[PDB]
């Protein structure tokens, strides 16, 4: 309704499995949501903050938030928004970086609250004890080939290649939507642009098996330019202080381009639509004073490394 | 050399992957080889025996014959040769299935003989304790979508349609050839017609991991009049003989039509070549003797259920 109204007029909403549903539901429950980060690395970047950052206003909208780290899915790798096949990192890598990616996502979730405290699961728990003629058998047989084929992730890359521990990838994300729908009453997955597909396919998979639950996805954040978002001379912008100073986090954000800073306030930033109009306001005015682009960096160095992180980054600049 | 020469002769080889290669190294050495049996009834059927007197002719011959029973692929169910989507059996079916199975299996091989002994083996074993991870992982990766998707069981099959279930079992297959070729020294896989393209993927999954091995398939046995080998009125032509009598059984055989009855000589008997040849001579000059037919008869009733069961089927005849 107003939670759902709020995303659109951000531009966090790139597509709904059904609108008016989840709209309904949101304004009538406490809605159990799920977001998964698969580690790739040891360290999340700013690729993840939509979909985290999306989470926590979930939460602060009165929903609970559940954090899932990829233990399972990363021993696999997702075909999903990528033109190449992966190479496969060891269970010992995976393991190790699950750790530190459960680390930075506690960050952003409150654990306080009563009623809607966060949670962060692990895949590795239900997809790790799991044999092969169990997973064909209860999870196989409600897919065809077909159905798959047609999947964006998988359409993208037949003539490419792809092998058949990718093109499975959609099954075990499925089942981990069946999964928490069943123990945790998780009634919505949301993710970056590229999940539509297996969302989607977790909801097949629910339908099929109990015959209820939404996905949502957000855009991919856009530049005026036409470049990346987030691709940097100096290389991606990490969430570890170790591996990306607070101040080399900061100047990222402070380095938007007027072209973008409104519409990365709208997406980063728990400033309201009177704060954020305001800037634009300020921004059409007075733009070599930079306020918009400073509020940014801010408000997500802040998030993301705290105040006193904040306040030397300020300093050192 | 000879026993491959042998082989065509009687119309049991419809495709080789490498004639040369396997001719010289069965002529050189003793070939552990193996065929595959999935439990899809509590009994075998006539469909069958082309598998299982090829593999008696292959350890005649002085190889060893590794007889396996599909414990854990008949919990999955194979495309291949079928038109339609097969409903899976549980678990307490197919394991009771197997036993039966296995016990049918062991009366055409021998046992006693030092240097070529068979044995009975279950995938299951094998296939029952893996977790899919490292199924995905380790067998997955060695295979596109794209070689998976030209095979003649789901090319067959995708318009009319195929689960991910389904088309996964060729993995299986193919692992039980890597498998069976690293523990018993397994270099060659027989099977029916249908089997090819399994039998392949296991060559393709031996050859990515140790980078040899052969594959061989028997012809679908062919009726002159057009009509499905084993197809009777009566439904099934069992080897138990508590689902089709051995008078039953016989009399299947018995009835053989002139047009036939030297192709499954050749192939159903062991029978030498100048036996053969002349019960053809004795076809041509007198057809109302029934000579051919009386010899498949009782070759075949003897092979499957013993003298004592083929004196009682002339009996009652
Ligand atoms: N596939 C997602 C991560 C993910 C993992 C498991 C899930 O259940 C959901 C999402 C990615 O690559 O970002
Ligand atoms: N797929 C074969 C049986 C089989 C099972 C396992 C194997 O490894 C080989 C063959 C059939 O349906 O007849």
């Given at each position: 309704?107003?939670?759902?109204?709020?995303?659109?007029?951000?531009?966090?909403?790139?597509?709904?499995?059904?609108?008016?549903?989840?709209?309904?539901?949101?304004?009538?429950?406490?809605?159990?949501?799920?977001?998964?980060?698969?580690?790739?690395?040891?360290?999340?970047?700013?690729?993840?903050?939509?979909?985290?950052?999306?989470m926590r206003r979930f939460?602060?909208?009165?929903?609970?938030?559940?954090?899932?780290?990829?233990?399972?899915?990363?021993?696999?790798?997702?075909?999903?928004?990528?033109?190449?096949?992966?190479?496969?990192?060891?269970?010992?890598?995976?393991?190790?970086?699950?750790?530190?990616?459960?680390?930075?996502?506690?960050?952003?979730?409150?654990?306080?609250?009563?009623?809607?405290?966060?949670?962060?699961?692990?895949?590795?728990?239900?997809?790790?004890?799991?044999?092969?003629?169990?997973?064909?058998?209860?999870?196989?047989?409600?897919?065809?080939?077909?159905?798959?084929?047609?999947?964006?992730?998988?359409?993208?890359?037949?003539?490419?290649?792809?092998?058949?521990?990718?093109?499975?990838?959609?099954?075990?994300?499925?089942?981990?939507?069946?999964?928490?729908?069943?123990?945790?009453?998780?009634?919505?997955?949301?993710?970056?642009?590229?999940?539509?597909?297996?969302?989607?396919?977790?909801?097949?998979?629910?339908?099929?098996?109990?015959?209820?639950?939404?996905?949502?996805?957000?855009?991919?954040?856009?530049?005026?330019?036409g470049t990346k978002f987030?691709?940097?001379?100096?290389?991606?912008?990490?969430?570890?202080?170790?591996?990306?100073?607070?101040?080399?986090?900061?100047?990222?954000?402070?380095?938007?381009?007027?072209?973008?800073?409104?519409?990365?306030?709208?997406?980063?930033?728990?400033?309201?639509?009177?704060?954020?109009?305001?800037?634009?306001?300020?921004?059409?005015?007075?733009?070599?004073?930079?306020?918009?682009?400073?509020?940014?960096?801010?408000?997500?160095?802040?998030?993301?490394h705290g105040e006193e992180?904040?306040?030397?980054?300020?300093?050192?600049?």
């Amino acid at each position: 309704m107003d939670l759902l109204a709020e995303l659109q007029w951000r531009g966090l909403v790139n597509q709904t499995t059904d609108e008016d549903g989840l709209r309904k539901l949101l304004n009538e429950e406490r809605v159990t949501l799920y977001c998964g980060f698969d580690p790739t690395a040891d360290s999340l970047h700013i690729g993840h903050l939509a979909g985290i950052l999306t989470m926590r206003r979930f939460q602060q909208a009165g929903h609970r938030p559940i954090a899932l780290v990829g233990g399972a899915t990363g021993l696999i790798g997702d075909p999903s928004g990528k033109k190449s096949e992966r190479t496969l990192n060891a269970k010992e890598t995976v393991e190790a970086w699950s750790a530190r990616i459960k680390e930075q996502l506690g960050r952003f979730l409150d654990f306080e609250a009563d009623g809607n405290p966060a949670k962060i699961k692990n895949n590795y728990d239900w997809i790790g004890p799991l044999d092969v003629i169990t997973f064909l058998r209860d999870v196989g047989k409600h897919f065809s080939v077909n159905y798959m084929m047609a999947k964006e992730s998988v359409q993208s890359r037949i003539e490419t290649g792809i092998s058949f521990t990718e093109f499975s990838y959609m099954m075990l994300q499925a089942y981990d939507f069946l999964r928490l729908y069943e123990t945790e009453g998780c009634r919505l997955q949301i993710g970056g642009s590229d999940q539509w597909g297996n969302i989607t396919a977790g909801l097949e998979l629910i339908r099929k098996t109990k015959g209820r639950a939404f996905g949502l996805t957000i855009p991919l954040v856009t530049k005026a330019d036409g470049t990346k978002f987030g691709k940097t001379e100096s290389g991606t912008i990490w969430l570890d202080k170790e591996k990306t100073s607070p101040y080399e986090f900061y100047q990222f954000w402070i380095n938007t381009d007027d072209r973008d800073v409104i519409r990365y306030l709208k997406y980063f930033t728990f400033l309201s639509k009177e704060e954020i109009e305001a800037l634009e306001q300020e921004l059409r005015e007075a733009p070599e004073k930079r306020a918009a682009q400073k509020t940014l960096a801010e408000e997500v160095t802040k998030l993301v490394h705290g105040e006193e992180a904040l306040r030397q980054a300020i300093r050192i600049s």
